[PDB]
């Protein structure tokens, strides 16, 4: 939407170049008075596993970022990574800064922008705010 | 004047003596898992494949202390990286597969690696 | 033009002053007191009050606040332990009513030393961006070479 | 619009105008090419400067690592791209990349190629292996 995420100055000024790491989350920027290597955020995912087998994440595959979904009912061998095993989950209204299922499975919480919205475990109707 | 009662108290000097002092207080079946010895040790074979090949040897040794028959020579400690639970995720054996080699890494590392597959299992 | 130059002890305040006055790099002693000197730059005569930065004297700067048109705050760019302390001194100095409209010039000094913090780094640590009520400027300096000194006098004269 | 960010200053270094900044293709080091006639590289995880190379005495606009050869390519206002070994510290090769100073270099790890872009309005290709 090209809306300003941040403006950064440093007391180095005149920023000539940019480049980005191809494996991602470091960008480095060349200035008149020096160079800086900078580290960008998001290093880790937000998700939670309840007891209903709705393990909910945001982003990823068979889930959108804006909406909320995910399920994981698979128990295949401990030695490898298990499939996504997602089942579809209803409405959301906010972005997931952190998105989490209830630890015993009755609530879902999506948190975002100074607000939390509560959606119901497997029905996803707005429970609470 | 060397040997401290402490962990340290600071600075490279104290730190260098300290790994000597640690080897004393646990000599038993090599260092196993190398202490502050690791830092100088890489430069000791800067030419270049020989470091990995060596490193691979220690990592294999460390996994387990097996029966130690003909080319089953892994020393160090018996349990410290186990081998082979069926609930362990994503398992020990993944690292063990590297050691089985056709050349899968380069030849110096290869010769070390084939012996090392034989040695753990 | 009336100038008050302060900063923590050993920042380089007297070195700066006598470099400016004598074109010479003198061998300082800690200043228990002040030095006051007049310097000519481009038709301006700056009267600079260099007031010692050790604790006892630090407690006395407030007597030199009144009538001050501009403030030179000298920082030792190589001393990272005391930067917070500098920040604390300078922040409440900014709250002083006699210093209310005075031009604020920071010298990040000893820029000549290999690990000196940059002026940008110093600007972030001192909180300079948050001054909206008056003129401020930061200038990298080396008082021994003379680097940045006259760029300072220049900025100051344009108050 | 919201996004998971957290800007952090991994390492800073002060030097005359750095035209190019790079991350090492496979290593945790970042190389910055400076107008000091020097290119400098620092590994901004352990905060150790791994090595410096004096390409020219006039600005080095570009620098990049050709990680496989264990070499670094630089292009400076010598109008040359000079190549050095970043662990055996010596100049691997010297060649005239262009008729003008070299603004940027791009490295193809899968091919022997570097193409370099210069302000002689031309981009030229060089093969490190030849």
Short mmCIF file of C-alpha atoms in Angstrom, two decimals:
data_model
loop_
_atom_site.label_atom_id
_atom_site.label_comp_id
_atom_site.label_asym_id
_atom_site.label_seq_id
_atom_site.Cartn_x
_atom_site.Cartn_y
_atom_site.Cartn_z
CA UNK A 1 0.00 0.00 0.00
CA UNK A 2 3.24 1.99 0.16
CA UNK A 3 2.58 3.67 3.44
CA UNK A 4 5.53 4.76 5.52
CA UNK A 5 6.75 1.92 7.77
CA UNK A 6 9.75 3.93 9.13
CA UNK A 7 12.17 6.87 8.45
CA UNK A 8 15.82 6.31 9.78
CA UNK A 9 18.56 8.80 10.06
CA UNK A 10 21.90 8.12 11.80
CA UNK A 11 24.16 11.19 11.89
CA UNK A 12 26.13 9.72 9.02
CA UNK A 13 23.87 11.04 6.28
CA UNK A 14 23.86 10.93 2.50
CA UNK A 15 22.78 7.41 1.89
CA UNK A 16 24.07 6.35 -1.51
CA UNK A 17 23.25 2.73 -1.73
CA UNK A 18 21.22 -0.07 -0.29
CA UNK A 19 21.64 -3.79 -0.74
CA UNK A 20 19.76 -6.74 0.81
CA UNK A 21 20.84 -10.20 2.02
CA UNK A 22 19.31 -12.87 -0.21
CA UNK A 23 18.77 -15.24 2.76
CA UNK A 24 16.98 -12.27 4.35
CA UNK A 25 16.68 -9.89 7.44
CA UNK A 26 20.00 -7.92 7.01
CA UNK A 27 20.18 -4.85 4.76
CA UNK A 28 23.21 -2.66 4.58
CA UNK A 29 23.28 0.95 3.45
CA UNK A 30 26.23 3.02 2.32
CA UNK A 31 26.58 6.55 3.57
CA UNK A 32 29.01 9.48 3.08
CA UNK A 33 30.54 9.22 6.48
CA UNK A 34 30.58 5.43 6.68
CA UNK A 35 28.70 2.27 6.25
CA UNK A 36 26.17 0.61 8.38
CA UNK A 37 24.93 -3.01 8.45
CA UNK A 38 21.49 -3.09 9.88
CA UNK A 39 19.36 -6.07 11.05
CA UNK A 40 15.64 -6.12 10.33
CA UNK A 41 13.02 -7.66 12.56
CA UNK A 42 10.79 -10.74 12.36
CA UNK A 43 13.00 -13.66 13.23
CA UNK A 44 10.42 -15.96 14.61
CA UNK A 45 6.80 -17.07 13.88
CA UNK A 46 3.68 -16.53 16.08
CA UNK A 47 1.56 -19.62 16.58
CA UNK A 48 -0.15 -21.79 19.24
CA UNK A 49 -1.30 -25.31 19.64
CA UNK A 50 -4.42 -26.05 21.60
CA UNK A 51 -5.96 -29.42 22.38
CA UNK A 52 -8.54 -29.32 19.46
CA UNK A 53 -5.74 -29.93 16.89
CA UNK A 54 -6.30 -26.42 15.64
CA UNK A 55 -2.68 -25.29 15.60
CA UNK A 56 -2.99 -21.80 14.35
CA UNK A 57 -0.52 -19.70 12.60
CA UNK A 58 -0.94 -16.76 10.26
CA UNK A 59 0.71 -16.34 6.77
CA UNK A 60 1.98 -19.65 5.45
CA UNK A 61 0.12 -22.11 3.12
CA UNK A 62 -3.73 -22.69 3.24
CA UNK A 63 -3.93 -19.66 5.50
CA UNK A 64 -3.89 -16.01 4.64
CA UNK A 65 -2.11 -13.42 6.82
CA UNK A 66 -5.11 -11.10 7.25
CA UNK A 67 -7.58 -13.95 8.04
CA UNK A 68 -6.75 -16.84 10.35
CA UNK A 69 -6.53 -20.54 9.87
CA UNK A 70 -4.60 -23.73 10.42
CA UNK A 71 -4.94 -27.08 11.81
CA UNK A 72 -2.56 -29.84 12.40
CA UNK A 73 -4.03 -33.17 13.07
CA UNK A 74 -1.15 -35.17 11.64
CA UNK A 75 1.05 -37.47 13.95
CA UNK A 76 3.40 -38.87 11.43
CA UNK A 77 6.91 -39.86 12.83
CA UNK A 78 8.76 -37.63 15.15
CA UNK A 79 11.99 -37.74 12.99
CA UNK A 80 10.81 -35.49 10.18
CA UNK A 81 8.66 -32.39 9.74
CA UNK A 82 5.00 -33.16 9.71
CA UNK A 83 2.64 -31.83 6.99
CA UNK A 84 0.70 -28.56 7.26
CA UNK A 85 -2.55 -30.60 7.71
CA UNK A 86 -4.55 -27.30 7.76
CA UNK A 87 -8.28 -27.08 8.07
CA UNK A 88 -10.05 -23.79 7.23
CA UNK A 89 -11.03 -21.33 9.97
CA UNK A 90 -13.55 -18.43 9.82
CA UNK A 91 -13.33 -14.60 10.11
CA UNK A 92 -10.75 -12.15 11.33
CA UNK A 93 -10.88 -8.32 11.25
CA UNK A 94 -7.25 -7.37 12.34
CA UNK A 95 -3.69 -8.19 11.41
CA UNK A 96 -1.89 -10.82 13.63
CA UNK A 97 1.00 -9.21 15.44
CA UNK A 98 0.85 -12.46 17.40
CA UNK A 99 -1.98 -15.05 16.58
CA UNK A 100 -2.66 -17.86 19.03
CA UNK A 101 -5.08 -20.64 19.89
CA UNK A 102 -6.21 -21.08 23.55
CA UNK A 103 -4.10 -23.70 25.34
CA UNK A 104 -7.06 -26.14 25.89
CA UNK A 105 -9.09 -25.05 22.85
CA UNK A 106 -12.13 -22.76 23.36
CA UNK A 107 -10.73 -19.36 22.24
CA UNK A 108 -8.58 -18.10 19.51
CA UNK A 109 -6.87 -14.75 19.98
CA UNK A 110 -5.52 -12.55 17.19
CA UNK A 111 -3.63 -9.67 18.55
CA UNK A 112 -2.63 -6.73 16.59
CA UNK A 113 -2.27 -2.98 16.55
CA UNK A 114 -2.83 -2.34 20.32
CA UNK A 115 -6.05 -4.46 20.06
CA UNK A 116 -6.98 -8.12 20.67
CA UNK A 117 -9.92 -9.75 18.96
CA UNK A 118 -11.17 -13.07 20.18
CA UNK A 119 -12.57 -15.50 17.90
CA UNK A 120 -14.19 -18.86 18.93
CA UNK A 121 -11.96 -22.04 18.90
CA UNK A 122 -13.38 -23.76 15.88
CA UNK A 123 -16.28 -21.67 14.76
CA UNK A 124 -14.50 -18.31 14.54
CA UNK A 125 -17.33 -16.02 15.37
CA UNK A 126 -16.35 -12.83 17.27
CA UNK A 127 -16.39 -13.83 20.89
CA UNK A 128 -14.74 -10.84 22.44
CA UNK A 129 -12.42 -7.88 22.01
CA UNK B 1 51.32 -18.27 39.75
CA UNK B 2 48.40 -20.23 38.12
CA UNK B 3 45.16 -22.12 39.28
CA UNK B 4 42.11 -20.27 40.44
CA UNK B 5 39.26 -21.35 42.79
CA UNK B 6 36.83 -19.38 40.75
CA UNK B 7 35.26 -19.68 37.33
CA UNK B 8 37.50 -16.84 36.12
CA UNK B 9 37.62 -13.36 37.11
CA UNK B 10 38.05 -11.75 33.52
CA UNK B 11 40.38 -11.09 30.56
CA UNK B 12 42.01 -13.48 27.80
CA UNK B 13 45.06 -14.33 30.07
CA UNK B 14 42.91 -15.82 32.94
CA UNK B 15 40.73 -17.37 30.32
CA UNK B 16 43.66 -19.15 28.60
CA UNK B 17 44.89 -20.63 31.93
CA UNK B 18 41.36 -21.62 32.82
CA UNK B 19 40.86 -24.28 30.00
CA UNK B 20 44.17 -25.92 31.31
CA UNK B 21 42.70 -25.93 34.83
CA UNK B 22 39.36 -27.41 33.53
CA UNK B 23 41.06 -30.34 31.80
CA UNK B 24 42.54 -31.22 35.16
CA UNK B 25 39.08 -31.28 36.87
CA UNK B 26 37.85 -33.95 34.24
CA UNK B 27 40.69 -35.66 32.27
CA UNK B 28 38.51 -38.68 31.73
CA UNK B 29 38.22 -40.05 28.08
CA UNK B 30 39.80 -37.10 26.38
CA UNK B 31 38.23 -33.61 26.84
CA UNK B 32 35.39 -35.15 24.74
CA UNK B 33 33.67 -31.89 24.03
CA UNK B 34 36.58 -29.44 23.51
CA UNK B 35 36.63 -26.56 25.92
CA UNK B 36 38.30 -23.27 25.06
CA UNK B 37 40.77 -25.36 23.12
CA UNK B 38 38.46 -24.95 19.99
CA UNK B 39 39.59 -21.37 19.13
CA UNK B 40 43.33 -21.94 18.49
CA UNK B 41 42.59 -25.39 17.06
CA UNK B 42 41.05 -24.39 13.71
CA UNK B 43 44.11 -22.29 12.67
CA UNK B 44 46.29 -25.36 13.44
CA UNK B 45 45.21 -26.71 10.02
CA UNK B 46 44.27 -23.59 8.00
CA UNK B 47 44.95 -25.48 4.79
CA UNK B 48 41.68 -26.23 4.39
CA UNK B 49 39.88 -29.49 4.11
CA UNK B 50 41.96 -31.03 6.89
CA UNK B 51 40.10 -28.92 9.62
CA UNK B 52 36.62 -30.26 8.57
CA UNK B 53 37.95 -33.83 8.31
CA UNK B 54 39.35 -33.50 11.86
CA UNK B 55 36.20 -31.78 13.09
CA UNK B 56 34.07 -34.61 11.60
CA UNK B 57 36.28 -37.12 13.54
CA UNK B 58 35.61 -35.39 16.91
CA UNK B 59 31.93 -34.99 16.15
CA UNK B 60 31.69 -38.80 15.40
CA UNK B 61 33.72 -39.78 18.54
CA UNK B 62 31.49 -37.55 20.65
CA UNK B 63 28.23 -39.10 19.42
CA UNK B 64 28.74 -42.28 21.40
CA UNK B 65 31.37 -44.82 22.73
CA UNK B 66 30.38 -48.09 20.96
CA UNK B 67 31.76 -51.58 21.20
CA UNK B 68 35.11 -50.56 19.67
CA UNK B 69 35.78 -53.54 17.40
CA UNK B 70 37.48 -53.42 14.10
CA UNK B 71 36.75 -49.97 12.78
CA UNK B 72 33.93 -49.41 15.36
CA UNK B 73 36.33 -47.00 17.19
CA UNK B 74 34.30 -44.27 18.68
CA UNK B 75 35.66 -43.22 22.20
CA UNK B 76 34.70 -40.19 24.22
CA UNK B 77 31.54 -40.53 26.34
CA UNK B 78 28.86 -43.22 26.02
CA UNK B 79 25.88 -40.80 26.34
CA UNK B 80 26.16 -37.18 25.54
CA UNK B 81 24.44 -37.25 22.11
CA UNK B 82 23.13 -40.77 22.47
CA UNK B 83 22.28 -42.89 19.63
CA UNK B 84 18.89 -43.69 18.33
CA UNK B 85 15.70 -42.88 20.10
CA UNK B 86 12.47 -43.46 18.16
CA UNK B 87 10.83 -40.27 19.64
CA UNK B 88 13.90 -38.05 19.01
CA UNK B 89 13.04 -35.34 16.41
CA UNK B 90 14.66 -34.86 13.64
CA UNK B 91 17.10 -37.46 14.94
CA UNK B 92 20.83 -38.20 15.38
CA UNK B 93 21.00 -40.30 12.13
CA UNK B 94 20.80 -37.27 9.76
CA UNK B 95 24.36 -36.28 10.85
CA UNK B 96 25.31 -39.98 10.66
CA UNK B 97 24.27 -40.13 6.92
CA UNK B 98 26.94 -37.41 6.06
CA UNK B 99 29.60 -39.82 7.12
CA UNK B 100 28.44 -42.32 4.55
CA UNK B 101 30.13 -40.94 1.56
CA UNK B 102 30.91 -41.56 -2.05
CA UNK B 103 32.72 -38.33 -1.95
CA UNK B 104 29.82 -36.10 -0.88
CA UNK B 105 32.06 -33.80 0.53
CA UNK B 106 35.63 -33.52 -0.79
CA UNK B 107 38.31 -36.38 -0.74
CA UNK B 108 40.18 -35.61 2.52
CA UNK B 109 36.92 -35.21 4.36
CA UNK B 110 35.68 -38.32 2.39
CA UNK B 111 38.36 -40.70 3.68
CA UNK B 112 37.74 -39.48 7.23
CA UNK B 113 33.97 -39.69 6.74
CA UNK B 114 33.82 -43.36 5.41
CA UNK B 115 35.88 -44.53 8.48
CA UNK B 116 33.64 -42.43 10.67
CA UNK B 117 30.35 -44.09 9.38
CA UNK B 118 31.97 -47.46 10.08
CA UNK B 119 33.13 -46.22 13.55
CA UNK B 120 29.79 -45.07 15.03
CA UNK B 121 27.57 -47.86 13.72
CA UNK C 1 28.55 37.17 21.10
CA UNK C 2 28.52 35.45 24.52
CA UNK C 3 29.33 31.71 24.59
CA UNK C 4 29.30 29.14 27.42
CA UNK C 5 31.40 26.05 26.79
CA UNK C 6 30.91 23.13 29.12
CA UNK C 7 31.01 19.36 29.11
CA UNK C 8 32.34 16.63 31.37
CA UNK C 9 35.94 16.72 32.56
CA UNK C 10 38.46 15.70 29.91
CA UNK C 11 36.13 16.29 26.98
CA UNK C 12 38.61 18.78 25.56
CA UNK C 13 37.05 22.16 26.42
CA UNK C 14 40.28 24.06 27.24
CA UNK C 15 42.20 22.42 24.42
CA UNK C 16 39.45 23.73 22.09
CA UNK C 17 39.55 27.23 23.56
CA UNK C 18 43.31 27.73 23.36
CA UNK C 19 43.53 26.12 19.93
CA UNK C 20 41.03 28.79 18.87
CA UNK C 21 42.79 31.65 20.70
CA UNK C 22 46.46 30.71 20.19
CA UNK C 23 46.38 28.39 17.17
CA UNK C 24 48.33 26.27 19.62
CA UNK C 25 47.74 22.90 21.31
CA UNK C 26 48.60 23.53 24.93
CA UNK C 27 49.29 21.12 27.76
CA UNK C 28 46.18 21.40 29.90
CA UNK C 29 45.59 20.91 33.58
CA UNK C 30 42.11 20.09 34.83
CA UNK C 31 40.29 23.39 35.07
CA UNK C 32 39.17 24.08 38.65
CA UNK C 33 37.34 27.16 37.72
CA UNK C 34 36.88 28.76 34.35
CA UNK C 35 38.97 30.18 31.54
CA UNK C 36 37.47 33.13 29.75
CA UNK C 37 38.82 34.36 26.45
CA UNK C 38 37.84 36.44 23.44
CA UNK C 39 38.22 35.02 19.96
CA UNK C 40 37.81 36.78 16.62
CA UNK C 41 36.10 34.96 13.79
CA UNK C 42 34.82 36.74 10.68
CA UNK C 43 33.92 40.07 12.35
CA UNK C 44 32.39 38.41 15.44
CA UNK C 45 34.13 38.60 18.82
CA UNK C 46 33.10 35.48 20.77
CA UNK C 47 33.57 35.67 24.49
CA UNK C 48 34.00 32.05 25.52
CA UNK C 49 33.59 30.88 29.07
CA UNK C 50 35.22 27.46 29.41
CA UNK C 51 33.97 26.11 32.71
CA UNK C 52 35.62 23.09 34.27
CA UNK C 53 33.77 19.81 34.09
CA UNK C 54 34.78 17.97 37.26
CA UNK C 55 31.99 17.50 39.82
CA UNK C 56 32.65 20.38 42.21
CA UNK C 57 32.79 22.83 39.31
CA UNK C 58 29.92 21.18 37.44
CA UNK C 59 27.79 22.22 40.42
CA UNK C 60 28.76 25.85 39.61
CA UNK C 61 27.89 26.25 35.89
CA UNK C 62 24.47 27.77 36.68
CA UNK C 63 26.18 31.06 37.57
CA UNK C 64 27.43 31.32 34.03
CA UNK C 65 24.07 30.58 32.38
CA UNK C 66 22.67 34.10 32.45
CA UNK C 67 23.33 36.25 29.36
CA UNK C 68 24.51 33.27 27.32
CA UNK C 69 23.69 33.57 23.63
CA UNK C 70 25.15 30.17 22.73
CA UNK C 71 26.25 26.98 24.42
CA UNK C 72 29.10 24.74 23.26
CA UNK C 73 28.73 21.28 24.74
CA UNK C 74 31.88 19.26 24.33
CA UNK C 75 31.74 15.47 24.40
CA UNK C 76 34.59 12.98 24.42
CA UNK C 77 33.52 10.70 21.54
CA UNK C 78 35.86 7.97 22.71
CA UNK C 79 34.33 7.59 26.20
CA UNK C 80 31.26 5.37 26.02
CA UNK C 81 30.80 4.88 29.72
CA UNK C 82 30.20 8.52 30.37
CA UNK C 83 27.89 9.30 27.41
CA UNK C 84 24.74 8.65 29.45
CA UNK C 85 26.05 11.00 32.12
CA UNK C 86 26.67 13.63 29.51
CA UNK C 87 23.11 13.08 28.25
CA UNK C 88 21.78 13.59 31.81
CA UNK C 89 23.76 16.79 32.41
CA UNK C 90 22.77 18.24 29.08
CA UNK C 91 19.06 17.42 29.33
CA UNK C 92 18.45 19.36 32.53
CA UNK C 93 20.67 22.11 31.16
CA UNK C 94 18.13 22.33 28.36
CA UNK C 95 15.50 22.88 31.06
CA UNK C 96 17.25 25.97 32.46
CA UNK C 97 15.29 29.18 32.03
CA UNK C 98 18.40 31.35 31.55
CA UNK C 99 19.51 29.01 28.76
CA UNK C 100 16.02 29.09 27.18
CA UNK C 101 16.80 30.66 23.81
CA UNK C 102 20.58 30.00 23.59
CA UNK C 103 21.94 28.31 20.45
CA UNK C 104 23.00 24.73 21.17
CA UNK C 105 26.16 23.47 19.58
CA UNK C 106 27.46 20.00 20.38
CA UNK C 107 31.07 19.18 19.63
CA UNK C 108 31.66 15.45 19.32
CA UNK C 109 35.36 15.64 19.99
CA UNK C 110 38.52 13.47 19.85
CA UNK C 111 37.08 12.31 16.54
CA UNK C 112 40.72 11.51 15.78
CA UNK C 113 40.66 8.39 17.97
CA UNK C 114 40.07 5.06 16.15
CA UNK C 115 37.01 3.99 18.17
CA UNK C 116 35.47 7.46 18.57
CA UNK C 117 31.68 7.26 18.31
CA UNK C 118 30.40 9.03 15.19
CA UNK C 119 28.53 12.32 15.44
CA UNK C 120 25.34 10.48 14.36
CA UNK C 121 25.75 7.91 17.14
CA UNK C 122 26.35 10.73 19.63
CA UNK C 123 23.29 12.57 18.33
CA UNK C 124 21.18 9.53 19.12
CA UNK C 125 22.69 8.99 22.55
CA UNK C 126 22.39 12.68 23.62
CA UNK C 127 18.79 12.90 22.39
CA UNK C 128 19.50 15.92 20.16
CA UNK C 129 16.69 15.19 17.67
CA UNK C 130 14.15 15.87 20.45
CA UNK C 131 15.06 19.58 20.79
CA UNK C 132 12.30 21.56 19.04
CA UNK C 133 12.40 24.80 21.07
CA UNK C 134 15.70 26.28 19.82
CA UNK C 135 18.62 25.94 17.34
CA UNK C 136 20.94 22.94 17.64
CA UNK C 137 23.79 21.53 15.60
CA UNK C 138 26.25 18.73 16.04
CA UNK C 139 29.77 18.95 14.68
CA UNK C 140 32.52 16.39 14.63
CA UNK C 141 35.68 18.00 15.90
CA UNK C 142 39.29 17.35 16.68
CA UNK C 143 40.57 20.11 18.88
CA UNK C 144 44.22 19.16 18.43
CA UNK C 145 44.08 19.34 14.61
CA UNK C 146 41.53 22.13 14.72
CA UNK C 147 39.07 20.11 12.61
CA UNK C 148 35.45 21.25 12.88
CA UNK C 149 36.24 24.12 15.23
CA UNK C 150 35.65 26.97 12.81
CA UNK C 151 32.69 25.11 11.25
CA UNK C 152 31.35 25.43 14.79
CA UNK C 153 32.11 29.13 15.07
CA UNK C 154 30.44 29.50 11.70
CA UNK C 155 27.25 27.74 12.67
CA UNK C 156 27.13 29.64 15.95
CA UNK C 157 27.49 33.04 14.28
CA UNK C 158 24.41 32.23 12.18
CA UNK C 159 22.16 31.90 15.25
CA UNK D 1 0.12 -0.62 7.28
CA UNK D 2 1.43 -2.95 10.15
CA UNK D 3 4.46 -5.17 9.70
CA UNK D 4 6.78 -7.23 12.07
CA UNK D 5 9.97 -5.11 12.04
CA UNK D 6 12.75 -4.30 14.62
CA UNK D 7 15.53 -2.23 13.15
CA UNK D 8 18.86 -2.89 14.85
CA UNK D 9 22.31 -1.46 14.05
CA UNK D 10 24.39 -4.61 13.63
CA UNK D 11 27.72 -2.86 12.96
CA UNK D 12 28.87 0.58 11.95
CA UNK D 13 32.10 1.70 10.62
CA UNK D 14 33.17 5.33 9.73
CA UNK D 15 34.99 5.91 6.44
CA UNK D 16 34.94 8.09 3.35
CA UNK D 17 31.84 7.68 1.19
CA UNK D 18 31.02 4.03 0.67
CA UNK D 19 29.42 3.64 -2.82
CA UNK D 20 28.70 -0.06 -2.45
CA UNK D 21 27.69 -2.36 0.45
CA UNK D 22 27.47 -6.04 0.04
CA UNK D 23 26.81 -9.10 1.93
CA UNK D 24 29.24 -11.92 1.32
CA UNK D 25 27.43 -14.52 -0.87
CA UNK D 26 27.61 -17.32 1.70
CA UNK D 27 29.54 -15.94 4.71
CA UNK D 28 28.25 -13.79 7.58
CA UNK D 29 30.65 -11.00 6.55
CA UNK D 30 29.50 -7.71 4.89
CA UNK D 31 31.98 -5.91 2.58
CA UNK D 32 31.62 -2.19 1.98
CA UNK D 33 33.51 -0.50 -0.69
CA UNK D 34 34.78 2.93 0.27
CA UNK D 35 36.18 5.99 -1.29
CA UNK D 36 39.32 5.47 0.78
CA UNK D 37 40.74 3.63 -2.22
CA UNK D 38 40.28 0.77 0.27
CA UNK D 39 37.51 -1.71 0.52
CA UNK D 40 36.98 -3.08 3.97
CA UNK D 41 35.10 -6.12 5.23
CA UNK D 42 33.73 -6.78 8.56
CA UNK D 43 31.91 -9.70 10.06
CA UNK D 44 29.20 -7.93 11.86
CA UNK D 45 28.20 -10.86 13.91
CA UNK D 46 31.34 -11.17 16.08
CA UNK D 47 32.24 -7.68 15.41
CA UNK D 48 35.64 -8.59 14.06
CA UNK D 49 37.04 -6.83 10.94
CA UNK D 50 38.22 -9.88 8.86
CA UNK D 51 40.32 -8.01 6.26
CA UNK D 52 40.93 -4.77 4.29
CA UNK D 53 42.26 -4.47 0.66
CA UNK D 54 43.86 -1.46 -0.92
CA UNK D 55 42.52 -1.62 -4.37
CA UNK D 56 43.52 1.85 -5.39
CA UNK D 57 44.60 5.20 -3.85
CA UNK D 58 41.55 6.73 -5.59
CA UNK D 59 37.98 5.60 -4.55
CA UNK D 60 36.77 2.03 -4.92
CA UNK D 61 33.19 2.33 -5.87
CA UNK D 62 32.23 -1.41 -5.96
CA UNK D 63 33.21 -4.49 -4.11
CA UNK D 64 31.80 -8.02 -3.99
CA UNK D 65 32.94 -11.50 -2.97
CA UNK D 66 33.42 -14.42 -5.41
CA UNK D 67 33.08 -16.78 -2.55
CA UNK D 68 33.99 -20.08 -4.45
CA UNK D 69 37.43 -18.81 -5.49
CA UNK D 70 37.75 -17.42 -1.94
CA UNK D 71 38.40 -14.11 -3.73
CA UNK D 72 37.00 -10.56 -3.69
CA UNK D 73 36.47 -8.39 -6.73
CA UNK D 74 36.70 -4.60 -6.38
CA UNK D 75 36.48 -1.93 -9.01
CA UNK D 76 38.13 1.26 -8.40
CA UNK D 77 38.98 4.55 -10.09
CA UNK D 78 42.06 2.77 -11.42
CA UNK D 79 39.37 1.69 -14.02
CA UNK D 80 40.44 -1.75 -13.03
CA UNK D 81 38.89 -4.62 -11.15
CA UNK D 82 41.52 -6.11 -8.95
CA UNK D 83 41.07 -9.36 -7.33
CA UNK D 84 42.43 -10.49 -4.15
CA UNK D 85 42.46 -13.66 -1.97
CA UNK D 86 40.64 -12.77 1.32
CA UNK D 87 42.45 -15.47 3.39
CA UNK D 88 45.95 -15.69 1.67
CA UNK D 89 46.04 -11.78 1.57
CA UNK D 90 47.59 -10.91 -1.72
CA UNK D 91 46.30 -9.62 -5.03
CA UNK D 92 45.10 -12.63 -7.12
CA UNK D 93 44.64 -10.64 -10.29
CA UNK D 94 44.68 -7.20 -11.76
CA UNK D 95 42.85 -6.36 -14.93
CA UNK D 96 41.25 -3.34 -16.59
CA UNK D 97 37.59 -3.88 -16.28
CA UNK D 98 36.60 -0.68 -18.07
CA UNK D 99 37.70 2.58 -19.53
CA UNK D 100 36.27 4.37 -16.46
CA UNK D 101 35.67 3.60 -12.86
CA UNK D 102 33.58 0.74 -11.85
CA UNK D 103 30.42 1.60 -9.99
CA UNK D 104 29.13 -1.91 -9.32
CA UNK D 105 30.21 -5.55 -9.89
CA UNK D 106 27.71 -8.53 -9.77
CA UNK D 107 28.96 -12.07 -9.31
CA UNK D 108 27.49 -15.19 -10.75
CA UNK D 109 28.40 -18.00 -8.49
CA UNK D 110 27.15 -20.62 -10.94
CA UNK D 111 29.15 -19.30 -13.86
CA UNK D 112 32.75 -17.96 -13.81
CA UNK D 113 31.37 -14.50 -14.53
CA UNK D 114 31.39 -11.10 -13.00
CA UNK D 115 29.85 -8.43 -14.95
CA UNK D 116 30.78 -5.05 -13.85
CA UNK D 117 29.02 -1.82 -14.65
CA UNK D 118 31.04 1.30 -15.19
CA UNK D 119 30.48 4.85 -16.17
CA UNK D 120 32.16 4.31 -19.53
CA UNK D 121 28.41 3.55 -20.44
CA UNK D 122 29.38 -0.10 -20.74
CA UNK D 123 29.17 -3.15 -18.75
CA UNK D 124 31.82 -5.74 -19.34
CA UNK D 125 32.05 -9.42 -18.51
CA UNK D 126 35.12 -11.08 -16.93
CA UNK D 127 35.76 -14.68 -16.31
CA UNK D 128 37.76 -15.31 -13.14
CA UNK D 129 38.90 -18.77 -14.22
CA UNK D 130 40.53 -17.59 -17.43
#
